[PDB]
Structure 1
Amino acid sequence: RPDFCLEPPYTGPGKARIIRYFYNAKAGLAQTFVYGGLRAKRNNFKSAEDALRTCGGA
């Protein structure tokens, strides 16, 4: 599983409220979170299906 999949979600400094997905490795689930629109990290997906394919494990 890529190492960036183990990071907590990162909202960042932007003032937007954009609903994105992160992979929660401890839970084993893709979950939603509020992203501010600036300086996303890689554990920040546009969909659940993308989060799971990238971070869900082989």
Structure 2
Amino acid sequence: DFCLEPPYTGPCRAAIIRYFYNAKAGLCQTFVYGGCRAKSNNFKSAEDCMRTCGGA
């Protein structure tokens, strides 16, 4: 959801993108959010990706 599980790309709205953490394939990925409380996960670079689930 934020680091491995399936990121929310459109739970409320349509579909918006940015960076997520896909800690299995190559880690830092993309999905931003698609409505709701922006699903908290919402990165844009390595520093972003890291502060949330990269180096926590």
Higher strand residue share: 1
If asked which structure has higher relative contact order (CA below 8 Å, sep 6+), I would say: 1
Q: TM-score, normalised by structure 2?
A: 0.59
Which segments of 5 or more consecutive residues in structure 1 lack a partner in the other structure? Answer: none
Q: Considering only aligned residues, what root-mean-square deviation do their CA atoms show, in Å?
A: 2.4
Gaps of 5+ in 2: none
Aligned residues: 53
State the 4+ residue runs in structure 1 displaced beyond 3 angstroms: none
- Percent identity, aligned pairs only, is 72
- How high is the TM-score relative to the length of structure 1? 0.57
